[PDB]
Design a protein around this ligand. Structure first.
Ligand SMILES: CC(C)[C@@H](NC(=O)[C@H](CS)NC(=O)CCC[C@H](N)C(=O)O)C(=O)O
Ligand SMILES: [Fe+3]
Length: 329
């Protein structure tokens, strides 16, 4: 038997305003959730998630195998040595059900000094033919900045929640250098569903993706209305209920590092469900050279002996480790 996680719905709209006491009341809710299961739903977020789901569906269901090879990351196409993060992540019929398209900061262009310097984790996005996917690139880039805006407000809530000034995290979250990514994940309905694409957990649960901590500061996730996520607690894994009107928010391991684990990165996994569905995360990453000094909210002096960790090194190591542990997505 599996229990259900407490995932409160938090009205985040005050974080866009100037009612400072109202913002503190949101911060308290974020604090409580971050100290409990680690997840909450952000509601009243102001993003048109219906259009997000529709546009994403039109892309996944119309892109052809030729287009997927042409956009494929290095793991599926040896010709694209520069595509470690951005591009298409192909399914393997009979073996791997999931497929996805990842893109990064639209400001990463050939003119960008990090591209010029060839710094790891920075890449220029790849896109399909505009005529074959009209409006898709424009929708996708607009969405990047829409969810960037929501995430910046959420970071103000996390900052206040930890007893800091509201820009403590957001000051490092900038359009000119953010390593944040969007991933448009398709989980297909398949009949028969290949056993090879289903993993079995230690506790016997059939999974599509094994346990992990998020590589992010925070994760801002939209999913269609199909329950699949589970969060680990001391009493075992608990089901996270689906809500296709809000965003599921949680801390990543960079937040756990800098708070001396006061806000843990919740361990989560994806149950196997034979249903057509969407999983559209926005990983709130900072700049490559962003460093946040660790602190410990449990101590009067707030002192932490943990080393300041550069976000770029954290991200590079984290993404490679996640592939090594849980497999190439
Ligand atoms: C919503 C999550 C559970 C989703 N999983 C995921 O997105 C998983 C675990 S957080 N994330 C990853 O594999 C890391 C993607 C990083 C991305 N290519 C980049 O370069 O930034 C899923 O549905 O599988
Ligand atoms: Fe995750």
């Amino acid at each position: 038997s599996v229990s259900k996680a407490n995932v409160p719905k938090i009205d985040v709209s005050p974080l866009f305003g100037d009612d400072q006491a109202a913002k503190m009341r949101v911060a308290q809710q974020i604090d409580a959730a971050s100290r409990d299961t680690g997840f909450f739903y952000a509601v009243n977020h102001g993003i048109n998630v219906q259009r997000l789901s529709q546009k994403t569906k039109e892309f996944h269901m119309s892109i052809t195998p030729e287009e997927k090879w042409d956009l494929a990351i290095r793991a599926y196409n040896k010709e694209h040595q520069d595509q470690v993060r951005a591009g298409y992540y192909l399914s393997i019929p009979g073996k791997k059900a999931v497929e996805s398209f990842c893109y990064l900061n639209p400001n990463f262009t050939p003119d960008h000094p990090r591209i010029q310097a060839k710094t790891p984790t920075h890449e220029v996005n790849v896109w399909p033919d505009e005529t074959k996917h009209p409006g898709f690139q424009d929708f996708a880039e607009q969405y990047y900045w829409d969810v960037f805006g929501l995430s910046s407000a959420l970071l103000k809530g996390y900052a206040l929640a930890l007893g800091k000034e509201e820009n403590f995290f957001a000051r490092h979250f900038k359009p000119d250098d953010t390593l944040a990514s969007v991933v448009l994940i398709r989980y297909p309905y398949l009949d028969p569903y290949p056993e090879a694409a289903i993993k079995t957990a230690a506790d016997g649960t059939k999974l599509s993706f094994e346990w992990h901590e998020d590589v992010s500061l925070i994760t801002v996730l939209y999913q269609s209305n199909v329950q699949n996520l589970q969060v680990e607690t001391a009493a075992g894994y608990q089901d996270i209920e689906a809500d296709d009107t809000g965003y599921l928010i949680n801390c990543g391991s960079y937040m756990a590092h800098l708070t001396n684990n006061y806000y843990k990165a919740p361990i989560n996994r994806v149950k196997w469900v034979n249903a057509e569905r969407q999983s559209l995360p926005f990983f709130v990453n900072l700049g490559y050279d962003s460093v946040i000094d660790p602190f410990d909210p449990r101590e009067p002096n707030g002192k932490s002996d943990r080393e300041p960790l550069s976000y770029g090194d954290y991200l590079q190591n984290g993404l490679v480790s996640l592939i090594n542990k849980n497999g190439q997505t």
